[PDB]
Design a protein around this ligand. Structure first.
Ligand SMILES: Nc1ncnc2c1ncn2[C@@H]1O[C@H](CSCC[C@H](N)C(=O)O)[C@@H](O)[C@H]1O
Ligand SMILES: [Zn+2]
Lengths: 76, 112, 86, 94, 179, 366, 176
């Protein structure tokens, strides 16, 4: 499942992942390929927040879709 | 199970807040203790310690010594104006006094 | 507006038989003429150093009136303990 | 082996090396600073406890500590230590 | 009054500081006091319109006999550049202010300095100087002589060996010369 | 506009600097677009305008008998809109001060605003009923439909660009509407506390970007980004950029506004009359201010391109900017006031060394 | 036989070896009392490291100069610039010849046969230009206005690195 994460800055980023991965795998992959601090990988599912404590298969998104990340400061 | 962010660094200070919270529970000062008081009090104690140690370090350099011996502390408190009013009835051990001679005890010259 | 608090006097309101009268309660025979200004200065200093703590307790209690207990508490802090108002 | 005793030596070491890079301290100066911090702590906690008994409350909040510092410290040093305390608490919250 | 041919215009050089309200009143070890000096020399003194000659350095805080007043600091030159800088400052029409420390170097005050350039001369002074050691770099420190009140323009003697330029200051018991 | 060579370490306001001891009984304050004027309402229904550069009182206009409690400037700076207990949709000129519109419509108004680009669209926030948008010539009024109808306290506004209409009830439910077709594109209930909701006092916006503020009633100012609402869309669940509160005194707020660059946030007490200033990005208090210690704060402004802050207390409007320090070398740039022994040897071209325009610039351009 | 004790700038880094000095914060024209009056004498100046903005003026000066004054003021001294080869002497600016590099083996030769002079810039024993002519009365000391912190080292011994080609001189280890 190659997800797209196009942010609000035209920063599209791809990750070919499994449908049964956790949030920590996505954190490790984005921190590997961009060094983005993983306290800002908030994602949006039809308005509602995609919470960062579950697995990917808990929401049943259509495979190889496009999401959006928000530049966030959490622990300052 | 999470990160053990100690209340010193979670605040952004240098004085501990656990020891302060223990010495406010176990001093019989009140029944219940809030959770802003030991932080605020740690900040106040830190700022006074920094205030005196700045002047102590300045005098310690300015008498050409490395360390700080308490004569520098006596000079640093009693030269300042507000810290002398705080430490009103206080005798620092090994302190000494300010050098002070009155205006009429020393001679003066008139002729030629 | 509505508040008429333009006051300039009242250090002169402590008049000048009054300090003479306090001095002759104190047992004082003969007084110079600068004692009046010096006494007004010392009285102003002392009443400032009491009214400051009085207003601090009044604000911390979250009120608008300075009851007598607060004045007693300020003077208790100063060292001049006062009896007969509690 | 002795029974462990309180002291504030390490924290004076840390604040001293934050405000002067290469200026040490003696032993007697460390005992003076220890007793100094103990003094200021006793006075402020006493004033706050007396305020708590006057106001018919039972809990030391931060409000009483602010009032005790504003009473006991003379003028401008109080107007700086209040700002230090408020900044530390607000950086502690978030 | 524009048709009038007022020609007070250009008879002197370019500089000014006049017309200020020059009427305020009618009336420890070494490096700690050096710190005190760098603190309080701004609030102690002031340069204003003199009646003696142009401008001068006044005094505002009541000074006891012996304390430090100001440091006469500026650029730092050696003994060679004197004639070159004097020829340049004479070419541009600029007065030359210098002060020798010792047998080594001289402190300039022309292009860069402080508010201490502006002390006139007398022969009954109330200021002098010595040589101190703030970590090797020696300095020029203005002591005092007697209790100076507020409003007085300050003076000091220049230690001149009696050796052209006349006495354009007018002291009381002066020898009608600087030298 | 001003000096460009001035920035010798510019600052952020510290001092008291002197106030307007001219006319008391002030009630509200707001600047124009550039930050050159300041309309101030009186107690009897008048207008006080103060010019900044000359530091002079510009114009006094007597509007009505009811006290003036809402003001806004047009984009050109020529149409003042206002409303009060007089119930009247007003519109005023800055060269003349004319009663151009007069429509006494009930449930008196708490806030007005123009659309930030077209001055034809104006905002109306009633005493009870839902907020109304109008035109200028005809009485085409657009009441926004509210599912609640139970608070009778709804706040709404336009953002920086005028793209959408952010609306808010007194239950803390937000209904984003498109600025012309009223498209309900986004909705969120505010995640107040653990579960229990709160009211909404006011909502304001910025001058650069889409960061904005939420002024609730649980003493917690919240900061969101409007593009996050746009990225959510319908049934949004935004969590804020930065949360704000002061639990030492537990102080509910009265007024907020942003900086000129969207970097700093000022907010004022309802109790102590003491102003606080925050950083948007890193997220901490930077400075506390004070004033007359026992007065009741009403309204706080900010100056966009220059660090000047306007307060209101006891009808007195303060102005706080640095009490700035002047020195030498502006009278004589060839001399610079040093402090200590400065050495001059780094150039090597000394000791008697002798070696071996065409830009046409307009004078009446812009 | 070392560097100078009397005729030095006192603030220099005249270390315990007294052969290598680091330049100070001015035109520190250090001289040496081992200077010539007349005859045939030559040594080397084994300059090793020369950082940027550390110039050096090369010549032979008379003992009545100043320690802080740079080379080439009047008949006492003759100077020359590193960059662009621009000699400055008696308040004259003349872009003259080609300069030098960094840390070469310098040292000039002067000859007074018993009124007439041999004044040529010797850069590693190479003709680089005739500076001046007809020197006047006095002893001649090696004076180099060491500009800033540079690594120069005077050479004394007979193991000459770049001696002049077919030029005769008494060696400089026979005076001190
Ligand atoms: N009374 C006097 N009148 C004119 N020049 C004086 C003087 N006393 C000293 N001088 C010479 O003039 C200089 C005084 S500095 C003069 C003060 C200031 N620069 C001004 O323009 O008003 C000194 O270099 C001194 O050599
Ligand atoms: Zn004279």
């Amino acid at each position: 499942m190659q997800i797209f994460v196009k942010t609000l800055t035209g920063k599209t980023i791809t990750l070919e992942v499994e449908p049964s991965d956790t949030i920590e795998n996505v954190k490790a992959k984005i921190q590997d390929k961009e060094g983005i601090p993983p306290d800002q990988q908030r994602l949006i599912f039809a308005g509602k927040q995609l919470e960062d404590g579950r697995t990917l298969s808990d929401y049943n998104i259509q495979k190889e879709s496009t999401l959006h990340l928000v530049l966030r400061l959490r622990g300052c | 199970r999470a990160k053990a962010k100690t209340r010193s660094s979670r605040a952004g200070l240098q004085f501990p807040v656990g020891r302060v919270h223990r010495l406010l529970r176990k001093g019989n000062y009140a029944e219940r203790v809030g959770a802003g008081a030991p932080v605020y009090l740690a900040a106040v104690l830190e700022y006074l310690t920094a205030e005196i140690l700045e002047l102590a370090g300045n005098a310690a350099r300015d008498n050409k010594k490395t360390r700080i011996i308490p004569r520098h502390l006596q000079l640093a408190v009693r030269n300042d104006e507000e810290l002398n009013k705080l430490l009103g009835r206080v005798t620092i051990a090994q302190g000494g006094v300010l050098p002070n001679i009155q205006s009429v005890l020393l001679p003066k010259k008139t002729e030629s | 507006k509505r508040h008429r608090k333009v006051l300039r006097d009242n250090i002169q309101g402590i008049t000048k038989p009054a300090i003479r009268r306090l001095a002759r309660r104190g047992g004082v025979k003969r007084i110079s003429g600068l004692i009046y200004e010096e006494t007004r200065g010392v009285l102003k200093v002392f009443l400032e150093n009491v009214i400051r703590d009085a207003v601090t307790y009044t604000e911390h209690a979250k009120r608008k009136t300075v009851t007598a207990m607060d004045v007693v508490y300020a003077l208790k802090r100063q060292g001049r303990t006062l009896y007969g108002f509690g | 082996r002795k029974t462990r005793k309180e002291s504030y030596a390490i924290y004076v070491y840390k604040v001293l090396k934050q405000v002067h890079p290469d200026t040490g301290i003696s032993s007697k100066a460390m005992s003076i600073m220890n007793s100094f911090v103990n003094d200021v702590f006793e006075r402020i906690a006493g004033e706050a406890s007396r305020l708590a008994h006057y106001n018919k409350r039972s809990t030391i909040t931060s409000r009483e500590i602010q009032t005790a510092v504003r009473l006991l410290l003379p003028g401008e040093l109080a107007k700086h230590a209040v700002s230090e305390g408020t900044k530390a608490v607000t950086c502690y919250t978030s | 009054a524009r048709a009038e041919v007022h020609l007070r215009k250009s008879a002197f050089d370019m500089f000014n500081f006049l017309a200020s309200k020059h009427r305020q009143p009618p009336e420890l070890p070494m490096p700690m006091r050096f710190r005190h000096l760098k603190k309080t020399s701004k609030e102690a003194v002031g340069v204003y319109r003199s009646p003696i000659h142009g401008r001068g350095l006044f005094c505002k805080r009541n000074i006891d006999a012996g304390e430090m007043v100001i440091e006469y600091a500026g650029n730092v030159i050696r003994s060679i550049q004197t004639d070159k800088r004097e020829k340049y400052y004479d070419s541009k029409g600029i007065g030359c202010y210098m002060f020798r420390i010792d047998d080594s170097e001289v402190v300039d005050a022309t292009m860069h300095g402080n508010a201490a350039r502006f002390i006139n001369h007398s022969c009954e002074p109330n200021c002098y100087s010595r040589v101190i050691n703030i970590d090797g770099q020696k300095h020029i420190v203005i002591f005092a002589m007697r209790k100076i009140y507020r409003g007085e323009e300050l003076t000091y003697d220049y230690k001149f060996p009696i050796e052209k330029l006349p006495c354009n200051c007018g002291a009381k018991k002066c020898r009608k010369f600087l030298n | 506009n001003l000096e460009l060579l001035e920035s010798f370490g510019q600052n952020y306001p510290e001092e008291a600097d002197g106030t307007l001891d001219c006319i008391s009984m002030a009630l509200t304050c707001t600047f124009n677009r550039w930050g050159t004027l300041l309309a101030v309402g009186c107690n009897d229904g008048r207008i006080v305008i103060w010019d900044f550069l000359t530091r002079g009182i510009a114009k006094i206009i007597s509007a009505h008998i009811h006290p003036v409690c809402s003001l806004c400037w047009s984009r050109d700076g020529h149409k003042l809109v206002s409303a009060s207990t007089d119930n009247i949709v007003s519109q005023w000129d800055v060269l003349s001060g004319d009663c151009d519109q007069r429509f006494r419509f009930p449930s008196p108004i708490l806030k007005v605003q123009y659309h930030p680009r077209d001055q034809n669209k104006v905002l109306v926030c009633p005493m009870k009923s839902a907020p109304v948008m109008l035109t200028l010539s005809d009485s085409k009024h657009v009441v926004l439909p509210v599912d609640d109808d139970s608070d009778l306290n709804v706040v709404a506004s336009f953002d920086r660009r005028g793209e959408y209409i952010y609306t808010g009830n007194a239950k803390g439910k937000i209904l984003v509407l498109k600025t012309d077709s009223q498209d309900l594109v986004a909705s969120f209930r505010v995640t107040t506390g653990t579960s229990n909701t709160t009211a909404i006092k006011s909502i304001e916006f910025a001058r650069k970007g889409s960061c904005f503020l939420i002024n609730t009633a649980d003493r917690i100012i919240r900061v969101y980004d409007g593009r996050e609402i746009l990225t959510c869309g319908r049934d949004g669940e935004p969590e804020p950029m930065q949360k704000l509160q002061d639990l030492v005194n537990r102080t509910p707020w009265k007024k907020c506004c942003f900086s000129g660059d969207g970097e700093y946030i000022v907010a004022g007490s309802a109790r102590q009359h003491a102003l606080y200033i925050w950083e948007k990005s890193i997220g901490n208090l930077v400075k506390i201010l004070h004033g007359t210690r026992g007065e009741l704060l009403l309204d706080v402004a900010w100056h966009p391109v220059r660090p000047i802050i306007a307060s209101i207390s006891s009808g007195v409007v303060s102005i706080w900017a640095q009490n700035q320090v002047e020195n030498w070398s502006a009278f004589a740039p060839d001399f610079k006031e040093l402090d200590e022994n400065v050495e001059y040897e780094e150039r090597e071209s000394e000791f008697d060394i002798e070696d071996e325009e065409d830009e046409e610039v307009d004078v009446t351009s812009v | 036989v070392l560097l100078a004790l009397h005729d030095r700038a006192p603030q220099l880094k005249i270390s315990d070896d007294r052969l290598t000095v680091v330049g100070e914060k001015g035109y520190s024209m250090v001289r040496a009392s081992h200077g010539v009056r007349k005859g045939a004498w030559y040594f080397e100046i084994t300059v090793d490291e020369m950082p940027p903005d550390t110039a050096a003026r090369l010549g032979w000066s008379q003992p009545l100069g100043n320690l802080q004054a740079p080379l080439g003021y009047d008949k006492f001294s003759y100077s020359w610039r590193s960059k662009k080869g621009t000699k400055f002497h008696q308040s004259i600016g003349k872009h003259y010849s080609s300069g030098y590099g960094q840390g070469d083996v310098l040292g000039f030769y002067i000859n007074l046969p018993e009124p007439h002079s041999e004044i040529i810039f010797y850069k590693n024993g190479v003709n680089q230009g005739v500076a001046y002519k007809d020197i006047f009365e006095g002893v001649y000391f090696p004076a180099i206005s060491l500009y800033k912190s540079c690594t120069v080292s005077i050479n004394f011994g007979p193991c000459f690195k770049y001696p002049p080609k077919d030029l005769t001189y008494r060696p400089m280890s026979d005076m001190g």
